[PDB]
């Protein structure tokens, strides 16, 4: 990092929630390259359940971890909207499989609380870099699949890489009142 032109530091350091490595997208589909680097995150697996349905089962387990159920006595609460992993099939439709990823604050990042839910697991190390896009429309699950495809095509003319069968989505808020909710789909960079 910065070759050998580094000064005395390491003690106190500030890390942005996202690292902008590029900008500019398109009038039809705008995207931005952002790299996130943390420490520990809360992952929840949900089978035999779609995305919206799974989150309903995942949120309770993941919420208890951030709320007051970690067998420690900490007050995490919450932090920004949660993101989940979705594995799109060749048919364009998911196959019941979603993993809810939680962003733990630097405060607990150094030593997060011991999970109480056997379903809630914390993964150490391994950062992910994805691109976020903002559009004016609704999106539940199958609709997201269409959005994730657009981003891929958009980056088609760029060095931007991806996984191939897994991406993340952002929303949280349910599709009720328009002009107030924002849906975004981030692809996992390979």
PDB file of C-alpha atoms in Angstrom:
ATOM      1  CA  UNK A   1       0.000   0.000   0.000  1.00  0.00           C
ATOM      2  CA  UNK A   2       1.550   3.258  -1.212  1.00  0.00           C
ATOM      3  CA  UNK A   3       4.819   1.420  -1.794  1.00  0.00           C
ATOM      4  CA  UNK A   4       7.389   2.527   0.776  1.00  0.00           C
ATOM      5  CA  UNK A   5       6.193   6.130   1.076  1.00  0.00           C
ATOM      6  CA  UNK A   6       4.265   5.394   4.265  1.00  0.00           C
ATOM      7  CA  UNK A   7       4.574   7.521   7.400  1.00  0.00           C
ATOM      8  CA  UNK A   8       4.182   6.597  11.069  1.00  0.00           C
ATOM      9  CA  UNK A   9       0.663   5.303  11.698  1.00  0.00           C
ATOM     10  CA  UNK A  10      -1.364   2.093  12.261  1.00  0.00           C
ATOM     11  CA  UNK A  11      -2.415   3.187  15.732  1.00  0.00           C
ATOM     12  CA  UNK A  12      -5.482   5.188  14.767  1.00  0.00           C
ATOM     13  CA  UNK A  13      -6.911   4.595  11.294  1.00  0.00           C
ATOM     14  CA  UNK A  14     -10.155   5.433   9.502  1.00  0.00           C
ATOM     15  CA  UNK A  15     -11.677   3.007   7.000  1.00  0.00           C
ATOM     16  CA  UNK A  16     -14.511   4.132   4.728  1.00  0.00           C
ATOM     17  CA  UNK A  17     -17.533   1.782   4.410  1.00  0.00           C
ATOM     18  CA  UNK A  18     -16.829   1.724   0.669  1.00  0.00           C
ATOM     19  CA  UNK A  19     -13.833   2.349  -1.591  1.00  0.00           C
ATOM     20  CA  UNK A  20     -14.673   4.128  -4.846  1.00  0.00           C
ATOM     21  CA  UNK A  21     -12.415   2.755  -7.583  1.00  0.00           C
ATOM     22  CA  UNK A  22     -14.505   4.012 -10.515  1.00  0.00           C
ATOM     23  CA  UNK A  23     -17.617   5.957 -11.519  1.00  0.00           C
ATOM     24  CA  UNK A  24     -19.933   6.767 -14.408  1.00  0.00           C
ATOM     25  CA  UNK A  25     -22.446   4.261 -15.721  1.00  0.00           C
ATOM     26  CA  UNK A  26     -25.297   4.819 -18.165  1.00  0.00           C
ATOM     27  CA  UNK A  27     -28.611   6.634 -18.592  1.00  0.00           C
ATOM     28  CA  UNK A  28     -30.427   3.290 -18.543  1.00  0.00           C
ATOM     29  CA  UNK A  29     -28.252   1.595 -15.923  1.00  0.00           C
ATOM     30  CA  UNK A  30     -25.852   3.454 -13.629  1.00  0.00           C
ATOM     31  CA  UNK A  31     -23.281   1.609 -11.521  1.00  0.00           C
ATOM     32  CA  UNK A  32     -20.360   2.397  -9.219  1.00  0.00           C
ATOM     33  CA  UNK A  33     -17.330   0.397  -8.091  1.00  0.00           C
ATOM     34  CA  UNK A  34     -17.117   0.275  -4.296  1.00  0.00           C
ATOM     35  CA  UNK A  35     -14.843  -1.941  -2.203  1.00  0.00           C
ATOM     36  CA  UNK A  36     -15.803  -2.772   1.382  1.00  0.00           C
ATOM     37  CA  UNK A  37     -13.285  -3.992   3.959  1.00  0.00           C
ATOM     38  CA  UNK A  38     -14.417  -5.146   7.389  1.00  0.00           C
ATOM     39  CA  UNK A  39     -13.667  -7.923   9.847  1.00  0.00           C
ATOM     40  CA  UNK A  40     -16.639 -10.031  10.915  1.00  0.00           C
ATOM     41  CA  UNK A  41     -20.169 -10.367   9.538  1.00  0.00           C
ATOM     42  CA  UNK A  42     -23.362 -12.191  10.508  1.00  0.00           C
ATOM     43  CA  UNK A  43     -24.434 -14.855   8.014  1.00  0.00           C
ATOM     44  CA  UNK A  44     -27.805 -16.616   8.104  1.00  0.00           C
ATOM     45  CA  UNK A  45     -28.719 -19.571   5.893  1.00  0.00           C
ATOM     46  CA  UNK A  46     -32.307 -20.239   4.826  1.00  0.00           C
ATOM     47  CA  UNK A  47     -33.418 -23.218   2.733  1.00  0.00           C
ATOM     48  CA  UNK A  48     -36.783 -24.266   1.284  1.00  0.00           C
ATOM     49  CA  UNK A  49     -37.662 -20.566   1.371  1.00  0.00           C
ATOM     50  CA  UNK A  50     -37.508 -17.752  -1.253  1.00  0.00           C
ATOM     51  CA  UNK A  51     -35.786 -14.411  -0.653  1.00  0.00           C
ATOM     52  CA  UNK A  52     -38.575 -12.345   0.903  1.00  0.00           C
ATOM     53  CA  UNK A  53     -39.812 -15.349   2.878  1.00  0.00           C
ATOM     54  CA  UNK A  54     -36.317 -16.389   3.967  1.00  0.00           C
ATOM     55  CA  UNK A  55     -35.531 -12.884   5.222  1.00  0.00           C
ATOM     56  CA  UNK A  56     -38.622 -13.103   7.423  1.00  0.00           C
ATOM     57  CA  UNK A  57     -37.063 -16.163   9.045  1.00  0.00           C
ATOM     58  CA  UNK A  58     -33.513 -14.806   8.820  1.00  0.00           C
ATOM     59  CA  UNK A  59     -34.281 -11.366  10.295  1.00  0.00           C
ATOM     60  CA  UNK A  60     -35.540 -12.811  13.633  1.00  0.00           C
ATOM     61  CA  UNK A  61     -32.379 -14.879  14.097  1.00  0.00           C
ATOM     62  CA  UNK A  62     -30.049 -12.115  12.902  1.00  0.00           C
ATOM     63  CA  UNK A  63     -31.970  -9.395  14.754  1.00  0.00           C
ATOM     64  CA  UNK A  64     -31.595 -11.189  18.085  1.00  0.00           C
ATOM     65  CA  UNK A  65     -27.832 -11.209  17.540  1.00  0.00           C
ATOM     66  CA  UNK A  66     -27.688  -7.453  16.970  1.00  0.00           C
ATOM     67  CA  UNK A  67     -30.393  -6.716  19.524  1.00  0.00           C
ATOM     68  CA  UNK A  68     -30.097  -8.440  22.879  1.00  0.00           C
ATOM     69  CA  UNK A  69     -29.361 -12.144  22.485  1.00  0.00           C
ATOM     70  CA  UNK A  70     -25.647 -12.890  22.121  1.00  0.00           C
ATOM     71  CA  UNK A  71     -24.896 -14.250  25.601  1.00  0.00           C
ATOM     72  CA  UNK A  72     -22.668 -11.285  26.445  1.00  0.00           C
ATOM     73  CA  UNK A  73     -24.741  -8.212  27.238  1.00  0.00           C
ATOM     74  CA  UNK A  74     -23.768  -5.854  24.427  1.00  0.00           C
ATOM     75  CA  UNK A  75     -25.848  -3.141  22.787  1.00  0.00           C
ATOM     76  CA  UNK A  76     -25.254  -3.347  19.043  1.00  0.00           C
ATOM     77  CA  UNK A  77     -28.753  -2.494  17.858  1.00  0.00           C
ATOM     78  CA  UNK A  78     -28.410  -2.097  14.098  1.00  0.00           C
ATOM     79  CA  UNK A  79     -26.495  -0.408  11.278  1.00  0.00           C
ATOM     80  CA  UNK A  80     -27.750   0.509   7.786  1.00  0.00           C
ATOM     81  CA  UNK A  81     -29.947  -1.884   5.722  1.00  0.00           C
ATOM     82  CA  UNK A  82     -28.999  -5.566   5.611  1.00  0.00           C
ATOM     83  CA  UNK A  83     -27.856  -7.382   2.472  1.00  0.00           C
ATOM     84  CA  UNK A  84     -28.513 -10.974   1.397  1.00  0.00           C
ATOM     85  CA  UNK A  85     -26.841 -13.324  -1.068  1.00  0.00           C
ATOM     86  CA  UNK A  86     -28.861 -14.739  -3.960  1.00  0.00           C
ATOM     87  CA  UNK A  87     -27.856 -17.588  -6.276  1.00  0.00           C
ATOM     88  CA  UNK A  88     -29.563 -17.078  -9.683  1.00  0.00           C
ATOM     89  CA  UNK A  89     -30.043 -20.203 -11.799  1.00  0.00           C
ATOM     90  CA  UNK A  90     -29.654 -20.574 -15.565  1.00  0.00           C
ATOM     91  CA  UNK A  91     -33.452 -20.357 -15.745  1.00  0.00           C
ATOM     92  CA  UNK A  92     -33.394 -16.838 -14.311  1.00  0.00           C
ATOM     93  CA  UNK A  93     -35.191 -17.958 -11.153  1.00  0.00           C
ATOM     94  CA  UNK A  94     -33.652 -18.680  -7.749  1.00  0.00           C
ATOM     95  CA  UNK A  95     -33.769 -22.161  -6.217  1.00  0.00           C
ATOM     96  CA  UNK A  96     -34.595 -21.462  -2.568  1.00  0.00           C
ATOM     97  CA  UNK A  97     -31.271 -20.312  -1.114  1.00  0.00           C
ATOM     98  CA  UNK A  98     -30.349 -16.981   0.472  1.00  0.00           C
ATOM     99  CA  UNK A  99     -27.657 -15.874   2.920  1.00  0.00           C
ATOM    100  CA  UNK A 100     -28.201 -12.698   4.947  1.00  0.00           C
ATOM    101  CA  UNK A 101     -24.955 -10.785   5.449  1.00  0.00           C
ATOM    102  CA  UNK A 102     -24.679  -8.305   8.320  1.00  0.00           C
ATOM    103  CA  UNK A 103     -22.195  -5.436   8.540  1.00  0.00           C
ATOM    104  CA  UNK A 104     -20.709  -5.295  12.038  1.00  0.00           C
ATOM    105  CA  UNK A 105     -19.391  -1.906  13.293  1.00  0.00           C
ATOM    106  CA  UNK A 106     -15.668  -1.383  13.884  1.00  0.00           C
ATOM    107  CA  UNK A 107     -16.528  -1.340  17.592  1.00  0.00           C
ATOM    108  CA  UNK A 108     -17.425  -5.036  17.534  1.00  0.00           C
ATOM    109  CA  UNK A 109     -15.471  -5.813  14.353  1.00  0.00           C
ATOM    110  CA  UNK A 110     -12.413  -6.366  16.526  1.00  0.00           C
ATOM    111  CA  UNK A 111     -14.243  -8.901  18.681  1.00  0.00           C
ATOM    112  CA  UNK A 112     -17.958  -9.440  17.866  1.00  0.00           C
ATOM    113  CA  UNK A 113     -20.284 -11.078  20.449  1.00  0.00           C
ATOM    114  CA  UNK A 114     -20.585 -14.868  20.578  1.00  0.00           C
ATOM    115  CA  UNK A 115     -23.676 -15.789  18.481  1.00  0.00           C
ATOM    116  CA  UNK A 116     -26.461 -17.582  20.351  1.00  0.00           C
ATOM    117  CA  UNK A 117     -28.490 -18.819  17.381  1.00  0.00           C
ATOM    118  CA  UNK A 118     -27.109 -22.051  15.924  1.00  0.00           C
ATOM    119  CA  UNK A 119     -28.317 -20.753  12.554  1.00  0.00           C
ATOM    120  CA  UNK A 120     -26.462 -17.450  12.924  1.00  0.00           C
ATOM    121  CA  UNK A 121     -22.783 -17.839  12.041  1.00  0.00           C
ATOM    122  CA  UNK A 122     -19.966 -15.293  11.799  1.00  0.00           C
ATOM    123  CA  UNK A 123     -17.344 -15.462   9.049  1.00  0.00           C
ATOM    124  CA  UNK A 124     -13.851 -14.127   9.746  1.00  0.00           C
ATOM    125  CA  UNK A 125     -11.736 -12.427   7.077  1.00  0.00           C
ATOM    126  CA  UNK A 126     -12.637 -12.460   3.366  1.00  0.00           C
ATOM    127  CA  UNK A 127     -13.758  -9.106   2.000  1.00  0.00           C
ATOM    128  CA  UNK A 128     -16.117  -8.544  -0.922  1.00  0.00           C
ATOM    129  CA  UNK A 129     -16.250  -5.855  -3.607  1.00  0.00           C
ATOM    130  CA  UNK A 130     -19.486  -5.155  -5.480  1.00  0.00           C
ATOM    131  CA  UNK A 131     -21.109  -2.410  -7.556  1.00  0.00           C
ATOM    132  CA  UNK A 132     -24.330  -0.686  -6.499  1.00  0.00           C
ATOM    133  CA  UNK A 133     -27.008   0.611  -8.865  1.00  0.00           C
ATOM    134  CA  UNK A 134     -30.026   2.822  -8.171  1.00  0.00           C
ATOM    135  CA  UNK A 135     -33.176   2.669 -10.296  1.00  0.00           C
ATOM    136  CA  UNK A 136     -36.760   3.883 -10.070  1.00  0.00           C
ATOM    137  CA  UNK A 137     -38.823   0.722  -9.802  1.00  0.00           C
ATOM    138  CA  UNK A 138     -39.983  -2.198  -7.671  1.00  0.00           C
ATOM    139  CA  UNK A 139     -38.163  -5.486  -7.081  1.00  0.00           C
ATOM    140  CA  UNK A 140     -38.973  -8.554  -4.985  1.00  0.00           C
ATOM    141  CA  UNK A 141     -36.981 -11.534  -6.259  1.00  0.00           C
ATOM    142  CA  UNK A 142     -37.498 -12.540  -9.892  1.00  0.00           C
ATOM    143  CA  UNK A 143     -37.467  -8.842 -10.760  1.00  0.00           C
ATOM    144  CA  UNK A 144     -34.077  -8.520  -9.082  1.00  0.00           C
ATOM    145  CA  UNK A 145     -32.751 -11.295 -11.270  1.00  0.00           C
ATOM    146  CA  UNK A 146     -33.512  -9.018 -14.203  1.00  0.00           C
ATOM    147  CA  UNK A 147     -31.728  -6.108 -12.512  1.00  0.00           C
ATOM    148  CA  UNK A 148     -28.625  -8.166 -11.753  1.00  0.00           C
ATOM    149  CA  UNK A 149     -28.481  -9.122 -15.430  1.00  0.00           C
ATOM    150  CA  UNK A 150     -28.515  -5.485 -16.539  1.00  0.00           C
ATOM    151  CA  UNK A 151     -25.528  -4.661 -14.331  1.00  0.00           C
ATOM    152  CA  UNK A 152     -23.611  -7.593 -15.810  1.00  0.00           C
ATOM    153  CA  UNK A 153     -24.336  -6.446 -19.360  1.00  0.00           C
ATOM    154  CA  UNK A 154     -23.439  -2.867 -18.442  1.00  0.00           C
ATOM    155  CA  UNK A 155     -20.022  -3.922 -17.145  1.00  0.00           C
ATOM    156  CA  UNK A 156     -19.719  -6.193 -20.200  1.00  0.00           C
ATOM    157  CA  UNK A 157     -17.678  -3.418 -21.786  1.00  0.00           C
ATOM    158  CA  UNK A 158     -15.383  -3.098 -18.776  1.00  0.00           C
ATOM    159  CA  UNK A 159     -12.729  -5.074 -16.817  1.00  0.00           C
ATOM    160  CA  UNK A 160     -15.275  -5.531 -14.014  1.00  0.00           C
ATOM    161  CA  UNK A 161     -15.423  -9.206 -13.040  1.00  0.00           C
ATOM    162  CA  UNK A 162     -18.034 -11.233 -11.152  1.00  0.00           C
ATOM    163  CA  UNK A 163     -18.892 -14.650  -9.722  1.00  0.00           C
ATOM    164  CA  UNK A 164     -21.278 -16.302 -12.159  1.00  0.00           C
ATOM    165  CA  UNK A 165     -24.099 -17.681 -10.017  1.00  0.00           C
ATOM    166  CA  UNK A 166     -24.324 -15.491  -6.911  1.00  0.00           C
ATOM    167  CA  UNK A 167     -25.053 -11.830  -6.174  1.00  0.00           C
ATOM    168  CA  UNK A 168     -26.313  -9.555  -3.397  1.00  0.00           C
ATOM    169  CA  UNK A 169     -29.392  -7.329  -3.192  1.00  0.00           C
ATOM    170  CA  UNK A 170     -30.421  -4.329  -1.090  1.00  0.00           C
ATOM    171  CA  UNK A 171     -33.875  -3.094  -0.129  1.00  0.00           C
ATOM    172  CA  UNK A 172     -35.241  -4.077   3.280  1.00  0.00           C
ATOM    173  CA  UNK A 173     -38.258  -1.787   2.914  1.00  0.00           C
ATOM    174  CA  UNK A 174     -41.309  -3.578   1.410  1.00  0.00           C
ATOM    175  CA  UNK A 175     -42.867  -2.511  -1.936  1.00  0.00           C
ATOM    176  CA  UNK A 176     -45.746  -0.391  -0.639  1.00  0.00           C
ATOM    177  CA  UNK A 177     -45.433   3.371  -1.115  1.00  0.00           C
ATOM    178  CA  UNK A 178     -43.436   4.482  -4.210  1.00  0.00           C
ATOM    179  CA  UNK A 179     -41.154   7.516  -4.449  1.00  0.00           C
ATOM    180  CA  UNK A 180     -39.783   6.430  -1.078  1.00  0.00           C
ATOM    181  CA  UNK A 181     -38.096   3.050  -1.541  1.00  0.00           C
ATOM    182  CA  UNK A 182     -34.846   2.299  -3.366  1.00  0.00           C
ATOM    183  CA  UNK A 183     -33.764  -1.097  -4.695  1.00  0.00           C
ATOM    184  CA  UNK A 184     -30.158  -1.934  -5.567  1.00  0.00           C
ATOM    185  CA  UNK A 185     -28.399  -5.098  -6.734  1.00  0.00           C
ATOM    186  CA  UNK A 186     -24.677  -5.685  -6.198  1.00  0.00           C
ATOM    187  CA  UNK A 187     -22.785  -8.405  -8.066  1.00  0.00           C
ATOM    188  CA  UNK A 188     -19.983 -10.315  -6.338  1.00  0.00           C
ATOM    189  CA  UNK A 189     -16.640  -9.469  -7.948  1.00  0.00           C
ATOM    190  CA  UNK A 190     -14.463 -12.509  -8.642  1.00  0.00           C
TER     191      UNK A 190
END
